[PDB]
Design a protein around this ligand. Structure first.
Ligand SMILES: CC(=O)Nc1ccc(C)c(Cl)c1
Ligand SMILES: [Mn+2]
Ligand SMILES: [Mn+2]
Lengths: 137, 137
């Protein structure tokens, strides 16, 4: 059957600024870069950046809620978020509707998130503060 | 420091067909559902389906190359691809790279992939046959 995300591929309009964002600003590990892409890792995540002439720099009001959240510890969360803010990284959401999260945009407007906590922890939190109509299986 | 992918959230136009697709067709585990979304798991992947009236059912020619690949073993790949074909799931690309890949669309046009092979396998193949402009770190 299916087991896990094998990789996340993000289309990017300008390869070098996107590599710099994920590697320098977010601290991911850069493994390889070529004329039309790059491979990075973030823990066990394989991230591919793919140069795509069709990728548009998209304001967050023009895209849907699809987004990619990266894990960070409770001890590191606030200083990492504050560093992104001080660096001028654009945001897209403020209301913490799914726990301790910071919502920010990549250079092309991909919707990203820093989040503290696992699915199990979110389910436990939701039992006390459930989403409207929530059922647990 | 970021330690991995925390969750993938897909905006969906209709929650019921999206739950059927990810849970019943793709075999992911449904943990919770509420009026406007659902939480599933696929191995270590935490998947959130978020009901979003801004989600358009998007033909593949009208979206960029951003896509989400799920891991499957080589032994299971062909029968899973056949299952998707029997279900009438559209393909958006043919495989021309190393490692088996099946490129298929979700009900809203999210670009998905089944892939066999890790980042390490891809890097080993690339070292033997580097892409144009390829540099390793
Ligand atoms: C022309 C040029 O400067 N290319 C270049 C710069 C930095 C990196 C990391 C790479 Cl692979 C290539
Ligand atoms: Mn999220
Ligand atoms: Mn892929």
């Amino acid at each position: 059957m299916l087991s896990g995300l094998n990789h996340l591929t993000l289309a990017v309009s300008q390869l070098a600024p996107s590599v710099a964002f994920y590697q320098q600003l977010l601290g991911m590990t850069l493994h390889a870069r070529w004329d039309s892409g790059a491979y990075l890792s973030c823990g066990d995540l394989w991230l591919c950046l793919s140069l795509d002439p069709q990728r548009r720099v998209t304001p967050p009001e023009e895209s849907d809620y699809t987004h990619y959240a990266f894990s960070i510890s409770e001890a590191d969360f606030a200083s990492f978020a504050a560093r992104l803010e001080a660096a001028g990284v654009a945001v897209w959401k403020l209301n913490r509707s799914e726990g301790a999260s910071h919502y920010f945009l990549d250079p092309d407007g991909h919707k990203l998130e820093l989040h503290v906590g696992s699915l199990a922890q979110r389910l436990a939190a939701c039992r006390e503060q459930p989403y409207k109509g929530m059922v647990f299986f």
